[PDB]
């Protein structure tokens, strides 16, 4: 579930990779407000969109949360990452929705495909479209 403006990869980019600022509230402001509800989890990876591309590289393996799809790849390192928990829901006003935020290092699991023709930028020709797993 993504905005329309978005190819997967530039909302993987919006969910995993720009966070806005350090604290899970702010930060999740900008996913919750594309998307119109206050997400529940959603984790932020202290790493580059060039990095991920390049860990699109690495073997493809089974996704953890769909057995039936090939397109996931291990990042091969940990990375650093913030996990932030929704703590304080808000349907009628999300803004006001707050979360907490937990500091880990881990491993990611993630899938890629290759990128959306018309509006993603050449470039990068395989792109991460969803975070599957931490590790």
Known sequence: MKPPQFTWA????????????????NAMQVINNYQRRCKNQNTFLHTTFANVVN???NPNMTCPSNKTRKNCHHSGSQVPLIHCNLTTPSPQN?????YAQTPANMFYIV???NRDQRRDP???PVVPVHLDRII
């Not at 999300?94 to 707050?98: E, G, L």
């Open 111 to 113: 899938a890629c495909d």
């Open 94 to 98: 999300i803004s006001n929705c707050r």
């Open 10 to 25: 530039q909302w993987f980019e919006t969910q995993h990779i720009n966070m806005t600022s350090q604290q899970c509230t």
């Open 55 to 57: 860990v699109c590289g």
């Open 122 to 124: 050449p470039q990068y």
